[PDB]
Write a protein that binds this DNA or RNA. Structure first.
Ligand SMILES: Cc1cn([C@H]2CC[C@@H](COP(=O)(O)OP(=O)(O)OP(=O)(O)O)O2)c(=O)[nH]c1=O
Ligand SMILES: [Mg+2]
Ligand code: NA
Ligand code: NA
Length: 332
DNA sequence: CGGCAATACTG
DNA sequence: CAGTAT
DNA sequence: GCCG
């Protein structure tokens, strides 16, 4: 009795197989660095299964029946169960390649491809990357420029303060608008790499053109250090940026502002609350098991044999016939 | 053996 | 398009 | 890497 999709089972903040799941997630990460999203995904699913188990895996046989556990995931677990360590995992963690790809990929703007190219070229440090400025995307120039701040875990108190500045901004334009903290904090975490906010208003349309003015406002306060505006397919609805959060005298924080109509707020909240892996299993389950496709705006039937609406996340869970799981249980 | 979540922007 | 972000 |  272990549902296959992570959106069918609870995934709490703290569980009973930390050592084991971290081992699998390291392989998932390593595969990622080797550009194998297939293997990364499979390891990630096994790790997710472990986070869900009601108690620690004492015997290698408690694995029997558990989905997503092939020969490879199985050998790794077994090895940690007897000797309390896995060689494949330790060699990965100690290897020069894994350690560098990790360091490079935590720089905002740097992904696996860029990281690999730089690695193959013999580059090994952030300072080596800074010496070649006329090569870096603006996203990366920013990541390197505020590297220290962006690496410092964000605290709930930083999230609070930002919510104060955002709500004040929104208040200068749209009275009665609501700003909701999403992302990991909504899931109960104490830290994050950034802060996510979802804005909306009860009256449809009363929120159009909101973001630009909110940004213009933050801009006048001279807090915007970087930004990128998005528009769903001025007049943009999403803002991915870095703000100078005063308190050093200030600290740079990544912030993502999302403006959504209240008709589709339940889908916006659902997508932006995560976890990341939770979204994937959710959307995958929507398709592979329900012929429908889910996104940040709504649920859709390729064939207009049915249309969808929702008032809360609970509604969206009904439409997919999934037992509800509050934010805190989506840490997949 | 094919699929693996679904979108938006920069360069 | 290639690559990175959520 | 695991699955249908
Ligand atoms: C990266 C990513 C994220 N999401 C959703 C689901 C989560 C929210 C917030 O993202 P974040 O990585 O900060 O996640 P968060 O959980 O807040 O992590 P931190 O605590 O900040 O590290 O966005 C997604 O659908 N697809 C993706 O590829
Ligand atoms: Mg976050
Ligand atoms: Na990065
Ligand atoms: Na984010």
């Amino acid at each position: 009795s272990m549902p296959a999709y992570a959106c069918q089972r609870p995934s709490p903040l703290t569980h009973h197989n930390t050592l084991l799941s971290e081992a699998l997630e390291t392989l998932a990460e390593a595969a990622g660095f080797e550009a194998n999203e297939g293997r990364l995904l499979s390891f990630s699913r096994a790790a997710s299964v472990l986070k869900s188990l009601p108690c620690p895996v004492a015997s290698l046989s408690q694995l029997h029946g558990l989905p997503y556990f092939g020969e490879h995931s199985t050998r790794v677990i077994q090895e940690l169960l007897e000797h309390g360590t896995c060689e494949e995992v330790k060699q990965v963690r100690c290897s020069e390649r894994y350690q560098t790809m990790k360091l490079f990929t935590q720089v905002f703007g740097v992904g696996v491809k860029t990281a690999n190219r730089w690695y193959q070229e013999g580059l090994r440090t952030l300072d080596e990357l800074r010496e070649q400025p006329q090569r870096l995307t603006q996203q990366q120039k920013a990541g390197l420029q505020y590297y220290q701040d962006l690496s410092t875990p964000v605290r709930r108190a930083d999230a609070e303060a930002l919510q104060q500045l955002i709500e004040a901004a929104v208040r200068q334009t749209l009275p009665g608008a609501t700003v909701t903290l999403t992302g990991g904090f909504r899931r109960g975490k104490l830290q994050g790499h950034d802060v996510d906010f979802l804005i909306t208003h009860p009256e449809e349309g009363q929120e159009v053109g909101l973001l630009p003015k909110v940004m213009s406002c933050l801009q006048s306060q001279g807090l915007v250090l970087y930004h990128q505006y998005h528009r769903s397919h001025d007049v943009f609805e999403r803002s991915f940026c870095i703000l100078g959060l005063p308190q050093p005298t200030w600290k740079a924080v990544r912030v993502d502002l999302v403006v959504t109509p209240s008709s589709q707020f339940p889908f916006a909240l659902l997508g932006w609350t995560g976890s990341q892996f939770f979204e994937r299993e959710l959307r995958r389950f929507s398709r592979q098991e329900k012929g429908l496709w889910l996104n940040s705006h709504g649920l859709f039937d390729p064939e207009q044999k049915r249309v969808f609406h929702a008032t809360s996340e609970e509604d969206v869970f009904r439409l997919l016939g999934l037992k509800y799981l509050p934010p805190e249980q989506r840490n997949a």
